[PDB]
């Protein structure tokens, strides 16, 4: 939905309503999905994590 992987995997309060199945084949974000790290800072090796979690 309106969250990104950072926001989703940390449990950003705006993503609580998302349903997360026990498996998935790829990930979809929207171009306007920017509910991420609501407290600013660095997400280390973020892109690696995204790839790890992609399926």
């Amino acid at each position: 939905g309106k969250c990104n992987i950072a926001g989703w995997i940390l449990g950003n309060p705006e993503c609580e309503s998302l349903s997360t199945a026990s498996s998935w084949s790829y990930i979809v974000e929207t171009p306007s999905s920017d509910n991420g790290t609501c407290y600013p800072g660095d997400f280390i090796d973020y892109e690696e994590l995204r790839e790890q979690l992609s399926s």
């Binding site: 995997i9 171009p31 407290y39 800072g41 280390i44 992609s54």
Partner: protein
């Protein structure tokens, strides 16, 4: 605090390190002025040192929070040690990664 992976699969553990804007904020949150955080498993090992300084306000914050992650193997222990500045895990994730997909960024409806 230690956790042993008894899930029979990899566990993604995420945590945060907080870097306060000021020495006052450091004391107000954690009391100890000179703190560290340590995270260790069989394959991961890293000590963190809070870097206290004023950053430009993002979302009204002059402090920063760094986010870290690692994959704990089945049967392995990960240990967290801290005297401050640790955003500890509450939920972690047992998972099985399959091959390699990717991330589609699109308005296209499911």
């Amino acid at each position: 605090k230690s956790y042993i992976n008894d899930k029979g699969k990899e566990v993604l553990v995420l945590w945060g390190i907080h870097h306060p804007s000021t020495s006052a904020d450091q004391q107000s949150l954690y009391q100890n002025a000179d703190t560290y955080v340590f995270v260790g498993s069989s394959r991961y090992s890293k000590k963190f040192k809070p870097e206290i300084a004023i950053r430009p306000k993002v979302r009204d914050q002059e402090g920063r929070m760094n986010y870290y992650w690692t994959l704990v193997e089945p049967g392995d222990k990960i240990t967290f040690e801290a005297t401050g500045n640790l955003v500890v895990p509450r939920y972690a994730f047992a998972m099985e990664r399959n091959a390699g997909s990717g991330i589609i960024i699109s308005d296209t409806p499911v």
